[PDB]
Design a protein around this ligand. Structure first.
Ligand SMILES: *[C@@H]1O[C@H](CO)[C@@H](O[C@@H]2O[C@H](CO)[C@@H](O)[C@H](O)[C@H]2NC(C)=O)[C@H](O)[C@H]1NC(C)=O
Length: 316
């Protein structure tokens, strides 16, 4: 009782099941040359094979969203596919081909993504999955990325070098709501416009952040920052700078802002825009401010001790 609706070279199939999918696709194969987009969203499909889709050699867009796909979705052999949407499924491991330009795969169980070597740019949407490290994405998936959304995953650390194959293409990196406690790596991201590392667990905004010197928008809101690398410099591009919700030593703010006066101004404007106030509200009134941010006097080695003792164990 399945239905194949159609509009030009774009087809949609409804009321299909694992048991009737094979038949539906046979019917579709009758006009395979005209199949540029196939929409299978909303069904109870629990699996689909590249082999099933192999005969559709002109297929550029495939929509599998809101099915019940699980385990491995391997479509690496669909050489023509440019856009794949499997939002809202249960996929654990995902493999896609050399023509992928846009990959929507939010709200799955994904812990592994692989992308065949390609030449174009990639936009990758992986919010709300089970990614625990950037190397869960293979090197193809980390090359020539333009937009990368990894929010609401379980990433523990970040090494910018692992994104070096996107140094010239990456424009947006969202890593908010992970559990990142350490960042390192020096990469010149020539095109990076936005970096979101808010709601992670960072204690030190270190020299690695020169990798983001050129951004327009950056947030480390609601981390656990105590210190900032005084040598960091941002550019005139910066319009949004959010370090609210941390635990800064006053000295570190004085040092950093002393050589980034315009950043101090951007910080104040950013807080004003978001809360209607020129400074953030502190949790403990025994706290003052340096510019817009709360801070405490952690002179001597107290600040360094908070950072070291924050992770008093060997490095994984
Ligand atoms: C894949 O199919 C889903 C479901 O039809 C699309 O999601 C909808 O997108 C349209 C247009 O953007 C919205 O009006 C609907 O509200 C969305 N529905 C849901 C449940 O999100 C989705 O856009 C399609 N993906 C692609 C890449 O075409």
């Amino acid at each position: 009782i399945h239905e194949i609706k159609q509009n030009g070279n774009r087809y949609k199939i409804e009321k299909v099941t694992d048991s009737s999918l094979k038949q539906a696709l046979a019917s579709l194969r009758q006009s395979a040359w005209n199949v540029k987009e196939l929409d299978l969203s909303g069904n109870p499909l629990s699996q689909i094979s590249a082999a099933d889709l192999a005969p559709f050699t002109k297929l550029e867009l495939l929509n599998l969203s809101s099915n019940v796909l699980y385990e491995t979705l391997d479509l690496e052999s669909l050489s023509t596919l440019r856009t794949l949407d499997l939002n809202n499924n249960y996929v654990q491991e995902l493999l896609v081909g050399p023509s992928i330009e846009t990959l929507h795969a939010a709200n799955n169980n994904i812990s592994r993504v692989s992308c065949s070597r390609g030449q174009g740019k990639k936009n990758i949407y992986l919010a709300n999955n089970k990614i625990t490290m950037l190397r869960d994405l293979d090197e193809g998936c980390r090359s020539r990325v333009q937009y990368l959304d990894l929010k609401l995953n379980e990433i523990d650390t970040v090494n910018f070098a692992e994104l070096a194959a996107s140094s010239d293409t990456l424009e947006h990196l969202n890593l908010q709501y992970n559990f990142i406690y350490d960042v390192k790596g020096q990469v010149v991201f020539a095109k990076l416009k936005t970096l979101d590392l808010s709601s992670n667990k960072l204690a030190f905004m270190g020299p690695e952040f020169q990798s983001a010197a050129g951004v327009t928008w950056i947030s480390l809101r609601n981390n656990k920052l105590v210190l900032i690398e005084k040598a960091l410099r941002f550019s005139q591009n910066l319009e949004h700078f959010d370090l609210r919700g941390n635990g800064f030593h006053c000295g570190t703010l004085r040092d950093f802002f002393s050589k980034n006066q315009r950043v101090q101004t951007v910080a104040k404007q950013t807080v004003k825009k978001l809360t209607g106030q020129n400074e953030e509200e502190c949790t403990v009134p025994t706290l003052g401010h340096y510019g817009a941010y709360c801070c405490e006097d952690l002179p001597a080695p107290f600040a360094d001790r908070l950072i070291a003792l924050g992770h008093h164990h060997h490095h994984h």
